[PDB]
Ligand binder design. Structure first.
Ligand SMILES: *[C@@H]1O[C@H](CO)[C@@H](O[C@@H]2O[C@H](CO)[C@@H](O[C@@H]3O[C@H](CO)[C@@H](O)[C@H](O[C@H]4O[C@H](CO)[C@@H](O)[C@H](O)[C@@H]4O)[C@@H]3O)[C@H](O)[C@H]2NC(C)=O)[C@H](O)[C@H]1NC(C)=O
Ligand SMILES: *[C@@H]1O[C@H](CO)[C@@H](O[C@@H]2O[C@H](CO)[C@@H](O[C@@H]3O[C@H](CO)[C@@H](O)[C@H](O[C@H]4O[C@H](CO)[C@@H](O)[C@H](O)[C@@H]4O)[C@@H]3O)[C@H](O)[C@H]2NC(C)=O)[C@H](O)[C@H]1NC(C)=O
Ligand SMILES: O=C(O)CC[C@H](NC(=O)N[C@@H](CCCC(=O)N(CCNC(=O)c1ccc(F)nc1)c1ccccc1)C(=O)O)C(=O)O
Ligand SMILES: O=C(O)CC[C@H](NC(=O)N[C@@H](CCCC(=O)N(CCNC(=O)c1ccc(F)nc1)c1ccccc1)C(=O)O)C(=O)O
Ligand SMILES: *[C@@H]1O[C@H](CO)[C@@H](O[C@@H]2O[C@H](CO)[C@@H](O)[C@H](O)[C@H]2NC(C)=O)[C@H](O)[C@H]1NC(C)=O
Ligand SMILES: *[C@@H]1O[C@H](CO)[C@@H](O[C@@H]2O[C@H](CO)[C@@H](O)[C@H](O)[C@H]2NC(C)=O)[C@H](O)[C@H]1NC(C)=O
Ligand SMILES: *[C@@H]1O[C@H](CO)[C@@H](O[C@@H]2O[C@H](CO)[C@@H](O)[C@H](O)[C@H]2NC(C)=O)[C@H](O)[C@H]1NC(C)=O
Ligand SMILES: *[C@@H]1O[C@H](CO)[C@@H](O[C@@H]2O[C@H](CO)[C@@H](O)[C@H](O)[C@H]2NC(C)=O)[C@H](O)[C@H]1NC(C)=O
Ligand SMILES: *[C@@H]1O[C@H](CO)[C@@H](O)[C@H](O)[C@H]1NC(C)=O
Ligand SMILES: *[C@@H]1O[C@H](CO)[C@@H](O)[C@H](O)[C@H]1NC(C)=O
Ligand SMILES: *[C@@H]1O[C@H](CO)[C@@H](O)[C@H](O)[C@H]1NC(C)=O
Ligand SMILES: *[C@@H]1O[C@H](CO)[C@@H](O)[C@H](O)[C@H]1NC(C)=O
Ligand SMILES: *[C@@H]1O[C@H](CO)[C@@H](O)[C@H](O)[C@H]1NC(C)=O
Ligand SMILES: *[C@@H]1O[C@H](CO)[C@@H](O)[C@H](O)[C@H]1NC(C)=O
Ligand SMILES: *[C@@H]1O[C@H](CO)[C@@H](O)[C@H](O)[C@H]1NC(C)=O
Ligand SMILES: *[C@@H]1O[C@H](CO)[C@@H](O)[C@H](O)[C@H]1NC(C)=O
Ligand SMILES: [Ca+2]
Ligand SMILES: [Ca+2]
Ligand SMILES: [Cl-]
Ligand SMILES: [Cl-]
Ligand SMILES: [Zn+2]
Ligand SMILES: [Zn+2]
Ligand SMILES: [Zn+2]
Ligand SMILES: [Zn+2]
Lengths: 694, 694
């Protein structure tokens, strides 16, 4: 038989291992010749595996690279101008790789050039609330200063935006062991911990969904008109560089001024963690100086697009996508994910050679330049927007398969909650102590839902990965899944060797998943979801699950507003219309489910599958959110304070944020009310797409 | 049998006459109690006629009305301040109506209040080129002056915008007999000509598709948040009033200054048509003074929405819509159209009571507040945007059925050219001398195509009527049709009694269409188009017809650019990518037609009908045109100089318009190139929706 169980049984742990090894021997940086060569390999093997067509789609986008003969580094300089201390030029390469070329040294992609000189201020994680504490409560002014911040808690792009608006003239980012160094485990190569010479690469853009900085709205094709650099989207205006904790100890050990305001400002190093500004008396005339010479340039990138045509609904698309570009070797991020995609293509191809086809079309993607701002996914979606919005059923992401070995992590649209629950009940747990039990049972036990007994935790989608254009711009139902670490004990700053040279095949095989059983479990979840979405006669979305979280989100935003009872009376601020819309959605969705359970008629079937497909689409507002035109979904956007986190009713949340500080309360509460109107209308319009059509 | 011929044969001239008489006995001004009463009548009769459901949809929108106890008028004042001349307070009412109440006096809807005083300048039709001639060639400065302009050639809203930007402090509009008074025909009530006391009402907004000035983007429902007046869309900033040619002769007869620059500036009255500024020497200290006291206020309006459910594709919508509100009696505009809609509903209802249903759903609409800015259609479409864009097949408009008695006028999307040609070949000509001939033959003979021998003229859609939100905002295929006057001899300023008290039932029955045979022909065209669109198994759109006009539009915009050969060399301005896209569209559309002619399979059928439905939709750009976010179609927009006229490749046209006057040629030619990029990309993306889907 050709059913889901045939599909699932053909996947093998041993194939995923082989592919991960094949993908991680050399660096595959976006825009380099070796990442083009890997794209041509993937295209050739996806055709051999059986897909009906496989093509490269290329784009010419803005990337960023260091200057090979003019290295980036930081100094302490004395009164006379001698550089008495210099940060490293490279990470000590790991055992066996000490002769590999083309390892890009640590840098912050898209930093402007400069050589600023001045006094240090320590700003903790550089969050919005950390700058409020500095300027409002401690009275410390960052204008004209170089800020040093530890990585962790929020996207590094938001840290840089926050430092810029406080008037900083440069930023220094470092990894503190309190966040990235765990209890009793050794540094690479003896364990999975971060060494004092290790450094986290990463871009520092604020794109808010735009894609290529030079071509917002349109694909970066051969005849594209480009903005000049000064009008480009999302570039930072001050120099930025990342360092390891050996180098950071040298820069912090001399800091004077105010004490840390409390113990949540202290890391793990043997230093006071004083806030500054400047150094203590003996070294009060010393200074910090940055040297940054990176350049921005328009470089070609390549997506691989494979197609497996549907037998019945060839004009309905189910997409499995993940990126292929890496900062260095990509042992976890992304090749642990791309190796799983490779095995999933191979199994669907096995079925196809025996004569099977799915009901709906499945599209497979190897994205480029994800690490430089989701550029490959976003340019392809800009090019194909009209097809994706009238034909796109769902998008399943496939970056890193593991960031731990404790239990499953799922973030998705409410429309897939029921699909995920049913599929994980039919899968075996790979966890020790759950031999012979379901993945549902082990996940539910190790990661309980906050709200409901006997259910597992499923989070909201945030951003910082390739689903952003499909979900928050186009309104296609999306999901992602991987193995992760324990929720208690989790500091939410990532795995220690994230975006480092130490992130290798050996990291994975020795310390994360020696048997490749977690990789295999994640391949069954991602591939099982794609199989049901593309083969089930009725789309596997449950509209009632949207109705439950919308009531939760409305209670939450109402409670934020109720902290200001006098202003709600003065300006006549009512949430009545939002709760009314949510009630109507609950009722109409309940009636829709009853009709979906009663009906031999394919037209009623296409009609009702189309109501299910366009329900996510219904939450899109073509005018976008305020000042963020490419974030169009009214229920979900990336937090304005942290691109990695999801925010619910983001229009209303942002109109309410820090409202008590605004100068014209009347105008600020007018905008709250406008955002309440937009959200009520949009929820009611979404509900009406599920009424009888005529 | 229940086929198109049964439908067409059930329509009767005598029914249309009766309904026109019923709709034109009293005024039906938007927002008044009598227009609400007519809406309740229409709803009740559409249910009796057989429709499955009929509902009122109401909205609270900004309208404008004069002050009953504080009349608008204009004066000539002397040195001492005595008003030596006063314009009329009302039009002399016609025979038999001299006791009807609630006739709104002449006014310009949405004029601000004021009483400005100053010297007159005559500006011809107040077009863009007339202000260029005044300021650039004649050196006459309109700053601080009251301008007087004749109606005709362009939408009165564009005239007011042009006067404002020249610095005028008020505007006076009048009807000149050279435009609105024809050869050897008598004034009402003895003929169809305009009397010297007649005046044209009309709004003077510049909405650019927004709808209700207070709620751009969202419906004006019960909980809507409203902008304050100062942030409202499209309101004029100087007082404006309309007058008849007796009053205009008094204001022009004393004008001094420069002579008219040529005979195209002279009308028909016995005056010099001097441009000013001010009066000749004897009366040089006299002045003109306006008195305007109209008020803007939020008023409820009511659309009637009738539904006839489809038997096979109930989730596909074919819409027949036209307005019901009138300035006074609405003898032509709009009730000559609404009476035709009434008879079309009655005939479809006859078939339905004998057991028939159309294949697709048909929606019938009686719009409100069209005369105040397309407000009823636009608010309903804003409310129902998600349903209309995923389910809307086509929209057929139904305002005035006659503006003449010479031949047919059709303006529509290229996708309906073939449908119109085939339907008119099956219809009888009502023209004298074409007894026993087809409507196609008489139309083709009296109104030949400019391009192709043996074909009739079909124009581009412009704007100034209720199709604007469906076509240029949402991208639903649209069309309109009516009887009109002879193309040569046509001055393009409208029928003489347009928006006047003299526009009555008697006007129509005595001078336009005594037998109601032109009304009947127009009902067969509008109703035949709706019948084919809603019942034909394959949608009746031909994509190849889009491919032919796109090449024509590309040749046209290229020729405008080639007037500047040195600048095209300096800035490397190429149209190669646009011609490449148009070539690709021609080829892909040709292959699509071949597939459409070969295929018992309903899924292939739904798939291919969906490619035909979404092809118009494919020309929509979600970011809109520059500064006009609600004009989203990249091929067609209303002219920026004349809302009534259509412009092709409007992004490029406007970047090129008057480019030789721009201060920074480099920036101006950069924007031309950007607009070439957007148009090529959009044409190619549209073509790709017609490729095989997988
Ligand atoms: C959720 O669904 C329900 C449908 O079950 C929907 O109910 C609607 O609520 C509005 C109230 O905002 C109703 O509007 C009324 O319509 C009548 C005519 O049918 C009008 O006469 C009413 O106007 C008068 O009263 C107002 C209120 O005091 C005055 O301000 C106004 O000036 C008038 O004097 C009023 O407009 C509507 O009829 C119901 N529809 C029903 C019951 O079918 C509700 O709106 C939905 N929620 C959302 C957020 O959409
Ligand atoms: C209309 O349809 C045709 C399809 O039949 C489509 O043709 C495409 O044109 C572009 C040219 O803009 C081709 O792009 C090339 O792709 C190859 C790889 O396949 C590249 O190597 C080429 O790049 C090199 O050469 C460039 C030109 O000098 C250099 O600037 C560049 O730096 C490289 O050195 C080039 O990008 C594309 O392959 C064809 N596709 C085909 C034939 O399948 C055409 O674009 C369509 N028109 C529009 C407006 O879309
Ligand atoms: O340009 C961009 O938008 C992103 C490009 C690139 N993307 C990327 O590296 N993404 C990784 C890592 C995303 C960050 C992350 O996984 N964590 C791990 C913790 N997980 C969560 O915070 C988390 C967030 C939302 C959610 F619903 N569940 C868990 C994290 C958080 C804060 C700081 C540092 C790392 C991924 O999605 O796997 C980058 O972030 O530099
Ligand atoms: O607010 C709005 O947008 C419009 C509200 C109202 N709409 C209205 O009255 N529309 C009428 C009249 C439209 C104007 C018109 O028909 N002509 C008659 C000449 N016809 C054309 O110009 C024409 C335009 C385009 C085309 F493709 N074919 C003929 C005209 C033109 C210029 C000045 C005065 C009148 C209609 O569409 O039947 C108004 O214009 O005040
Ligand atoms: C990764 O696997 C690929 C595919 O097996 C290897 O590429 C093949 O290499 C052999 C020997 O050089 C050639 O005969 C084929 O032409 C290649 N196939 C392709 C490109 O599809 C590749 O060498 C492996 N890489 C590593 C680092 O082991
Ligand atoms: C997940 O599984 C449940 C339980 O099997 C499915 O719910 C059942 O669906 C059948 C078929 O329509 C109904 O007759 C039952 O009454 C349902 N049981 C319930 C709601 O308790 C559910 O549909 C599945 N979810 C999917 C496929 O998305
Ligand atoms: C226009 O036609 C309508 C419908 O025939 C007339 O309205 C009806 O009037 C009669 C007599 O007053 C009543 O019995 C009905 O209740 C009305 N029907 C409705 C409102 O649907 C109306 O009087 C006619 N108007 C004119 C001006 O002749
Ligand atoms: C208008 O009428 C023409 C002529 O009847 C239609 O074109 C024919 O359509 C049939 C059925 O598909 C073809 O087999 C013929 O070859 C066509 N003749 C041609 C193209 O010369 C045309 O389709 C009609 N237009 C519509 C329905 O929109
Ligand atoms: C790299 O640095 C050198 C200076 O040592 C400079 O001349 C060269 O142009 C730089 N490369 C760039 C900017 O690409
Ligand atoms: C740091 O580098 C600079 C430039 O190469 C050099 O002049 C200086 O001596 C170095 N300082 C130390 C302490 O090594
Ligand atoms: C911070 O310092 C600079 C002056 O060097 C000044 O422009 C800014 O206003 C200061 N802000 C304060 C003191 O709040
Ligand atoms: C893998 O599993 C073991 C078993 O608990 C755990 O102690 C170890 O830390 C895990 N490895 C990683 C990288 O978390
Ligand atoms: C109409 O005019 C009178 C003045 O004669 C004024 O008092 C009244 O308020 C006006 N009505 C309005 C502005 O609605
Ligand atoms: C015009 O009207 C005003 C105000 O009613 C009046 O004072 C004046 O006499 C009138 N002028 C003439 C010439 O009738
Ligand atoms: C028109 O007149 C006014 C002065 O009253 C002036 O502001 C404007 O610049 C003038 N324009 C000219 C003379 O071009
Ligand atoms: C109606 O038709 C006659 C016949 O040519 C024509 O002379 C007359 O002017 C027409 N009426 C109107 C209003 O155009
Ligand atoms: Ca782009
Ligand atoms: Ca509105
Ligand atoms: Cl992922
Ligand atoms: Cl019309
Ligand atoms: Zn990644
Ligand atoms: Zn990454
Ligand atoms: Zn009208
Ligand atoms: Zn009108």
């Amino acid at each position: 038989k050709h059913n889901m169980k045939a599909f699932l049984d053909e996947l093998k742990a041993e194939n995923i291992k082989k592919f991960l090894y094949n993908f991680t021997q050399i660096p595959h940086l976006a825009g380099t010749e070796q990442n083009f060569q890997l794209a041509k390999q993937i295209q050739s093997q996806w055709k051999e595996f059986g897909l009906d067509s496989v093509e490269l789609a290329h784009y010419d986008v803005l990337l960023s690279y260091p200057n090979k003969t003019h290295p980036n580094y930081i100094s302490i300089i004395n009164e006379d101008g001698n550089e008495i201390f210099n940060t490293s030029l490279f990470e000590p390469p790991p055992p066996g790789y000490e002769n590999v070329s083309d390892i890009v040294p640590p840098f912050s992609a898209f930093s402007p050039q400069g050589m600023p000189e001045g006094d240090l201020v320590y700003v903790n994680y550089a969050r919005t609330e950390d700058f409020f504490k500095l300027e409002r409560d401690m009275k410390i002014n960052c204008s004209g200063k170089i800020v040093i911040a530890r990585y962790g808690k929020v996207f590094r792009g938001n840290k840089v935006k926050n430092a810029q608006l406080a008037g900083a003239k440069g930023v220094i980012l470092y990894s503190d062991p309190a966040d990235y160094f765990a209890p009793g485990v050794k540094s690479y190569p003896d364990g999975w911990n971060l060494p004092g010479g290790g450094v986290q690469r990463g871009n520092i853009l604020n794109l808010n969904g735009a894609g290529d900085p030079l071509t917002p709205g349109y694909p970066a094709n051969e005849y594209a008109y480009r903005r000049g650099i000064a009008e480009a989207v999302g570039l930072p205006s001050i120099p930025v560089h990342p360092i390891g904790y050996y180098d950071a100890q040298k820069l912090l050990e001399k800091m004077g001024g105010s004490a840390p305001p409390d113990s949540s400002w202290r890391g793990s190093l043997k230093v006071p963690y004083n806030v500054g500004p400047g150094f203590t008396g003996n070294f009060s005339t010393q200074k910090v100086k940055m040297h940054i010479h990176s350049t921005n340039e328009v470089t070609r990138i390549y997506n691989v697009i494979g197609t497996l045509r549907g037998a019945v609904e060839p004009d309905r698309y189910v997409i499995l996508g993940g990126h292929r570009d890496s900062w260095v070797f990509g042992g976890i991020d992304p090749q642990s994910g791309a190796a799983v995609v490779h095995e999933i293509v191979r199994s669907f191809g096995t079925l196809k050679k025996e004569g099977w086809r799915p009901r709906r079309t499945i599209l497979f993607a190897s994205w480029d330049a994800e690490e430089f701002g989701l550029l490959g996914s976003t340019e392809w979606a800009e090019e194909n927007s009209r097809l994706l919005q009238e034909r796109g059923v769902a998008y399943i992401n496939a970056d890193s398969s593991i960031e731990g070995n404790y239990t499953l992590r799922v973030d998705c649209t409410p429309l897939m909650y029921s699909l995920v629950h049913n599929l994980t009940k039919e899968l075996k747990s790979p966890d020790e102590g759950f031999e012979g039990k379901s993945l549902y049972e082990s996940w539910t036990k190790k990661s309980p839902s906050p709200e409901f007994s006997g259910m597992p935790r499923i989070s909201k989608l945030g951003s910082g990965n390739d689903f952003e254009v499909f979900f928050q711009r186009l309104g296609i139902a999306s999901g992602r899944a991987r193995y992760t670490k324990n929720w208690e004990t989790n500091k939410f700053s990532g795995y220690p060797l994230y975006h480092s040279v130490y992130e290798t095949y050996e990291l994975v095989e020795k310390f994360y998943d020696p048997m490749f059983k977690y990789h295999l479990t994640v391949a069954q979840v991602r591939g099982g979801m794609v199989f049901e979405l593309a083969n089930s006669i009725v789309l596997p979305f449950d509209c009632r699950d949207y109705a439950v979280v919308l009531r939760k989100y409305a209670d939450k935003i109402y409670s934020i507003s109720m902290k200001h009872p006098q202003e709600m009376k003065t300006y006549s601020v009512s949430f009545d219309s939002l709760f009314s819309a949510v009630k109507n959605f609950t009722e109409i969705a309940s009636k829709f489910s009853e009709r979906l359970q009663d009906f031999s008629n394919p037209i009623v079937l296409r009609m009702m599958n189309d109501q299910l497909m366009f329900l996510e689409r219904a939450f899109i507002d073509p005018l976008g959110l305020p000042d963020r035109p490419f974030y169009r979904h009214v229920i979900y956007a990336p937090s304005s304070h942290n691109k990695y986190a999801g925010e619910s009713f983001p229009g209303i949340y942002d109109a309410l944020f820090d409202i008590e500080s605004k100068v014209d309360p009347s105008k600020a509460w007018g905008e709250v009310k406008r955002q309440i109107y937009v959200a009520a209308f949009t929820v009611q319009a979404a509900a009406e797409t599920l009424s009888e059509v005529a």
